[PDB]
Design a protein around this nucleic acid. Structure first.
Ligand SMILES: Nc1ncnc2c1ncn2[C@@H]1O[C@H](COP(=O)(O)OP(=O)(O)OP(O)(O)=S)[C@@H](O)[C@H]1O
Ligand SMILES: Nc1ncnc2c1ncn2[C@@H]1O[C@H](COP(=O)(O)OP(=O)(O)OP(O)(O)=S)[C@@H](O)[C@H]1O
Ligand SMILES: [Mg+2]
Ligand SMILES: [Mg+2]
Lengths: 330, 257, 183, 318, 256
DNA sequence: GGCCCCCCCGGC
DNA sequence: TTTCGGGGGGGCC
């Protein structure tokens, strides 16, 4: 790196260093801590969605086992490094079959993002894992479990990293606010958690952008409005008004309301579609075909939007689909 | 400039780099007022290389403050090949440099070739793994060690070294057969350059990969003798002494099982 | 049976143009030292001094054997000694070079009525009971493979001393040959 | 803190053929072969965590006794097994001269033989035949179809079945008795339920429990272990109403952290093998699931797409 | 150790091995109380190598009962190359051997190097090389024959040897013209080594391939005079005499 | 020993 | 037949 840690992005500045700084995965953290505290470390696998703390957890565990010099006592490989059959057959085998250079102890191999590895390399890894288990332990990290071969999964003990809970996100936000000398409104925190979707990376990025947005962060307070302008996301009031107009007004009024709401702050149609879907999924529809039509048509519109197209036609299609689907309610 | 170090003959640095370019990828130099000390670890984390070129090997060596330089041996060798084998070589660096300057000068003519190699942000420590008290320390001509390694590696991919009282044994057990070479200490006053010395504390028996020894033996072109220090629970040290510095290979033995 | 001395090359040998043109080629028009030094005391055994080349598993010539097929095809038309090629499937594109340079001999799957007495003899010598009525089924289990059926008999007889209708179903289901179908 | 304990999967790996549970007929055949000898060329096939490698290793050890280090040549996917290796190293090993008891032969073990290329398998053909009086071959594979027909013809087929709940329970109870592990019946039932016939997974989960929480009960097992998501997908796709299917998809899969691609692939696989639904309905469902899978692959992987897939599936199943 | 052969220097064994290493891959030695014999057939089953070393070539030799040792030339040569040229080479083999031990000992530096080579299982029985009434018994110096075959191989892939009354014709008809060489019985007193002698009985005409003759002449450095025994229709016998023993190449002729 | 080239699979 | 990427196996050097 260069200069102090204050030059780093918040996603990297607040990376957990120890195992007590990881939040939202209490069960997994406790289990791994107990395993490391008694020498009962098996071949580990961490399966989870993006931005949940798998890499942070494994690096913290390696630091706990070895110490500050963990980088000189582990073999860490990821998607940026070639991991072909030759690599598995030579480099990994040599690392697993040899003693530590610096200080005594067992050998740890961290194959981060192993789901990117080919089937041949994973197959070659089988006996490598099973033969040097006396002195070596393997850790695998994955987001998609369908890419891993059945045998490799069979040889590993699985741990699932759940989407981050609300309480853990609030505690981390409190720590970040205290360190950064920031003030966050309760509704601002609510909006941040809602838009995070269980990812701490999104929380930290949005909070950094909000801090940048404030003119005088020293005594200014971050409000839900700041989040909405920073992210460009529709306000809940805007979504509610659009849905109300679509559901109990004529086509002209609905079109005018949608256009005005979108042009007030330059909102995107995709965010509106997601918001309306979230609102409608809480509705109690009398008829199932209403929900079926809503889901099918909105999914089609979302797929069409994903490839460009005409924005006005797409908005009119959204309005018409909602109206037609709700006509079935009677 | 902050650091200015002149090699009278570029062949010296080319040979020193040639001694360990086949076993490591990224090297880290750390220049001080007492010379240039460099470290390099291999991709498998099984072999470490430590070089300690001294200030007596340069025509003039000036270094104000310690300076770190992370480099890739492939690019360094590529550029060093550019310069001729009859020209003086100046290594130049500035405060917190972004590049290292290699200046080839031919006093015969007025031709000056300056090459700037961009540095890498390699942040690591040396840890000075030089375990105090080893179990056995032997010294013998590099030619004999190279011959033994080349002969035995053709039998097996693993070579076992046993140190017993006045006995050094190299054993290989392959598929077609096995091969054992036994050498005992001896001294010749007429030609001490060929003598073999052994100082023993406890018996030693350590296995090593043939590929790493084949890589290490390439340093015999720099020194006529090699010193091998072995100790259980510690990596094996293979030292080749130079005019003012030395080149050390720390090789981790294989797990016994 | 005809007295010829056998020279054999299998897939375990690298049958590439470079080594094929430096190896077996010389034997195509050369006598056999083994034949002369072994049949010196015999009479009327002319074939003993000659060679018979047997190229087994031609279809097994993978990338490890570069240009071997073409060289074999060339030899087929310019060989001074009898040459027999053996392959499993003849209708591959890779076997086209042998289109019309050899006499093609097809070996079809033997019927269940051809190896019946052999199976009785094996059962009698090995001291286990093999009811003839279940022999036919076994032939369908291995799709007319004599080696496979003999191996099946050897393996099953290890613990089961009777091969009858009360257990033939299990053996047939557990030893079914799964041959990939064609277009 | 820097010393590792041997996992139970390796600490209690069967060392004699009598300790291998399941496939009683094949194990008895192997035991009788060991008692007598004359081991034939064999191919052991099956699914993960059943005891194929254990069976081959135990057979070779018991057959060759003290001569294991000189009469066994073991090669797996972690070793180079190309055409050159087959044509030189294996050929030299087969041609090697070694003194063994009357009815014993050298053993060439090729673990995970399925990965071997066609050229190497073809080269092995005549080598297995010319030297069958001194060397025998034991292939171990997961997919027998990857071994060429000529090689299968020369060997004895040994297709292993999945371990039943009774055998897994027996081996697990033996391990518990040896390690003196407190347990409850429901915990063992949950361990077997998650194992799905995989002994390695069963032992790994049993160690994770006890190592993690102590007494083995359903609560701790399910705290550390997750019920196989294929069953959740099957329940989602068999719901009578769209509301229930969406509720399952949200609560049990989306909120648990499972990716959309994993969900759609599992749905495809589960729909393939739903014997209680007509083939035409399954084919229509597979068409819809393929449309959704293509959409997800294009990059649009969202809860809305999976909900639309469920809605279309319920449309078809009506 | 039942077999304890001991060569004075490792040069001899390596030289004999190189004499016939390039034509065969597997060899089989019978070692008895009278010496060592070896018979090897090439992969093409055309060229046979017959080597024998007497008890006079060994500084010490002891063999309780006959021993048959099957070996591969490549591995033996690789193990031999490891030892130095000026050492003592001891071949050691125990009862019912599975491997043969080669001990290279240097008494000056006091160095011992032990290499164990695993033996191969060879079932081919040795062909009975019974004495034949060779029609023609030519004998010519090694250098002349080596040069003649090397020159003629460049022109043609096979050469025809014709032995007639005081006439030896090495015809080399082939792609490059028809260049040939002719020799007649010659005797010299200053250097008897260059004494070409002919003992023909019935005229001989036999053709042989270039590869086998090249391989045979590759071993010309192991002797000085080569004895070529030819017959009307039989393998030609090329003999190199050793200090104690001999090395023969039986090369089968070609059709017509 | 190292490039350089050609050929062949890819689900479970 | 057939749009990359990975692996093997041979050919120059
Ligand atoms: N449980 C967590 N506790 C605190 N911060 C977290 C946590 N998880 C993620 N983060 C934050 O997000 C950043 C990235 O965390 P990562 O460990 O990279 O997540 P990840 O699951 O390994 O990413 P993937 O699966 O490779 S996309 C960290 O620097 C943390 O600041
Ligand atoms: N029948 C069994 N009895 C007892 N333990 C078993 C049995 N099968 C598997 N195991 C246990 O699981 C561990 C691994 O068994 P393996 O023999 O490696 O399975 P495998 O079928 O050979 O794996 P694959 O097919 O290469 S993925 C053993 O060490 C045993 O501890
Ligand atoms: Mg990560
Ligand atoms: Mg296995």
């Amino acid at each position: 790196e260069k200069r102090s840690k204050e030059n780093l992005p918040w996603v990297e500045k607040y990376r957990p260093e120890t195992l007590d700084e990881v939040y939202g995965q209490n069960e997994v953290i406790t289990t791994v801590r107990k395993f490391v505290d008694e020498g009962k470390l098996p071949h580990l696998l961490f399966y989870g969605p993006p931005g949940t703390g798998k890499t942070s957890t494994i690096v913290a565990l390696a630091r706990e086992i070895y110490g500050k010099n963990y980088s000189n006592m582990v073999l860490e490989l990821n998607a940026s490094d070639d991991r072909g059959i030759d690599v598995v057959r030579n480099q990994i085998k040599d690392f697993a079959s040899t003693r530590q250079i610096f200080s005594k102890g067992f050998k740890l191999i961290i194959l981060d993002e192993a789901d990117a590895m080919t089937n041949a390399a994973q197959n070659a890894l089988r006996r490598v894992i099973e033969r040097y288990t006396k002195n070596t332990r393997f850790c695998v990290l994955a987001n998609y479990a369908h890419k891993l071969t059945p045998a490799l999964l069979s040889r590993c003990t699985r741990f699932r990293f759940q989407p981050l809970p609300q309480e853990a996100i609030e505690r981390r936000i409190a720590n970040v606010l205290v360190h950064e000398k920031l003030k966050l409104s309760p509704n601002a925190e609510k909006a941040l958690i809602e838009l995070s979707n269980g990812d701490m990376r999104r929380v930290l990025n949005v909070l950094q952008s909000c801090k940048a947005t404030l003119d005088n962060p020293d005594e200014d307070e971050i409000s839900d409005d700041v989040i909405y302008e920073c992210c460009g996301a529709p306000r809940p009031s805007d979504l509610k008004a659009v849905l109300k107009s679509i559901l109990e007004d004529d086509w002209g009024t609905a079109h005018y309301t949608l256009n005005k709401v979108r042009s007030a702050k330059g909102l995107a149609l995709i965010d509106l579609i997601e918001g309306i879907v979230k609102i409608l999924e809480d509705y109690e529809l009398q008829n199932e075909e209403t929900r079926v039509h809503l889901l099918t048509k909105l999914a089609d519109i979302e797929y069409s939007i994903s490839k460009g197209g005409n924005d006005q036609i797409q908005g009119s299609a959204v309005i018409g689909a909602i109206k037609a689907s709700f006509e079935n309610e009677t | 400039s902050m650091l200015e170090a002149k090699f009278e003959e570029a062949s010296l640095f080319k040979r020193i780099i040639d001694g360990f370019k086949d076993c490591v990828q990224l090297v880290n130099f750390q220049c001080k007022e007492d010379g240039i000390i460099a470290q390099a670890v291999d991709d498998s984390r099984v072999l470490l290389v430590s070089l300690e070129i001294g200030v007596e090997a340069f025509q003039e060596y000036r270094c104000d403050h310690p300076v770190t330089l992370g480099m890739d041996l492939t690019s360094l060798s590529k550029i060093l090949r550019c310069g001729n084998n009859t020209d003086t070589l100046t290594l130049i660096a500035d405060n917190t440099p972004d590049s290292i300057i290699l200046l080839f000068e031919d006093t015969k003519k007025d031709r000056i070739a300056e090459y700037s190699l961009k540095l890498m942000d390699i942040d690591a420590d040396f840890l000075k793994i030089e375990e105090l008290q080893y179990d056995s320390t032997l010294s013998l001509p590099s030619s004999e060690f190279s011959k033994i390694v080349r002969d035995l590696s053709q039998l097996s991919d693993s070579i076992n070294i046993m140190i017993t009282k006045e006995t050094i044994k190299f054993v290989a057990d392959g598929d077609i057969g096995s091969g054992s070479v036994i050498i005992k200490p001896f001294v010749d006053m007429e030609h001490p350059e060929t003598s073999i010395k052994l100082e023993m504390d406890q018996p030693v028996d350590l296995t090593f990969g043939a590929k790493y020894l084949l890589d290490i033996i390439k340093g015999s072109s720099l020194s006529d003798r090699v010193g091998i220090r072995l100790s259980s629970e510690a990596p094996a040290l293979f030292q080749f002494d130079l005019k003012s510095g030395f080149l050390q290979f720390f090789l981790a033995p294989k797990f016994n099982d | 049976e005809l007295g010829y001395d056998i020279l054999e090359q299998n897939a375990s040998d690298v049958r590439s143009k470079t080594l094929l043109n430096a190896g077996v080629k010389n034997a195509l028009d050369n006598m056999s030292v083994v034949g002369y030094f072994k049949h010196n005391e015999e009479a009327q055994n002319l074939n003993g001094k000659h060679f018979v080349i047997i190229m087994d598993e031609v279809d097994g010539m993978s990338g490890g054997d570069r240009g071997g097929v073409g060289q074999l095809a060339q030899f087929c038309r310019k060989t001074s000694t009898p040459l027999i090629l053996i392959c499993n499937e003849r209708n591959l594109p890779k076997m086209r070079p042998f289109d019309r340079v050899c006499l093609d001999i097809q070996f079809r799957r033997p019927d269940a009525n051809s190896i019946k007495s052999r199976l009785m003899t094996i059962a009698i010598r090995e001291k286990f009971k093999l009811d003839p009525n279940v022999i036919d089924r076994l032939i369908q289990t291995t799709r007319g493979d004599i080696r496979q059926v003999i191996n099946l008999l050897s393996t099953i007889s290890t613990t089961t001393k009777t091969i009858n209708h009360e257990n033939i179903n299990e053996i047939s289901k557990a030893w079914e040959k799964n041959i990939a179908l064609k277009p | 803190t820097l010393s590792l304990q041997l996992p139970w999967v390796e600490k209690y790996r069967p060392q004699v053929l009598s300790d291998i549970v399941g496939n009683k007929e094949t194990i008895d055949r192997l035991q009788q072969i060991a008692k007598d000898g004359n081991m034939p060329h064999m191919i052991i096939s099956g699914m993960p965590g059943i005891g194929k490698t254990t069976s081959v290793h135990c057979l070779a050890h018991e057959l060759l006794g003290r001569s294991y280090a000189d009469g066994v040549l073991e090669l797996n996917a972690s070793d180079d097994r190309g055409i050159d290796v087959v044509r030189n190293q294996i050929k030299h090993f087969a041609q090697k001269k070694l003194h063994l008891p009357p009815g014993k032969h050298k053993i060439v073990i090729l673990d995970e033989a399925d990965s071997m290329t066609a050229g190497a398998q073809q080269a092995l053909r005549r080598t297995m035949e010319l030297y069958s009086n001194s060397t025998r071959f034991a292939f171990a594979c997961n997919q027998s179809n990857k071994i060429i027909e000529p090689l299968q013809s020369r060997c004895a087929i040994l297709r292993y079945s999945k371990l039943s709940d009774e055998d897994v329970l027996k081996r697990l109870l033996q391990i518990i008795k040896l390690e003196d592990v407190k347990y409850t019946n429901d915990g063992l039932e949950a361990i077997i339920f998650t194992a799905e016939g995989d002994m390695r997974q069963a032992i790994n989960n049993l160690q994770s429990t006890v190592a993690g929480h102590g007494l083995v009960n359903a609560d701790n097992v399910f705290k550390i272990v997750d019920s196989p998501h294929p069953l959740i997908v099957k329940k989602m796709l068999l719901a009578s109403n769209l509301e229930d299917s969406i509720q399952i998809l949200r609560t049990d899969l989306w909120k648990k952290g499972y990716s959309s691609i994993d969900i759609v692939t599992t749905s495809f696989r589960v729909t393939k093998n739903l014997a209680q639904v007509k083939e035409s309905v399954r084919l229509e469902m597979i068409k819809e699931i393929g449309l959704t899978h293509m959409r997800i692959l294009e990059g649009v992987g969202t809860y809305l797409q999976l909900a639309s897939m469920l809605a279309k599936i319920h449309k078809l199943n009506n």
